[PDB]
């Protein structure tokens, strides 16, 4: 989906406990469980790729990181 729909999502789980800029680690983990819990088949890629973005040396998506990864999952 288009960038603009994620943040929508985004904002929503980031505002409740955490950063409200940014998805907390277990803000994630709810937001996984509701879109592709089961729909990945329980592929390593979805960890993979959150693990990569939290390489800033954080427990918390930040807000960049997420948008480019929708951006580049186009391809």
Known sequence: KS????KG?????????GDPN?????ELKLLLQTEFPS????????DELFEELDKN?????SFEEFQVLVKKISQ
């Open 22 to 26: 940014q998805l907390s680690k277990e």
């Open 3 to 6: 960038p603009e729909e994620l």
């Open 57 to 61: 040396g954080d427990g918390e998506v």
């Open 9 to 17: 999502i985004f904002e929503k789980y980031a505002a409740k406990e």
């Open 39 to 46: 729909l990945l088949k329980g592929m390593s890629t979805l």
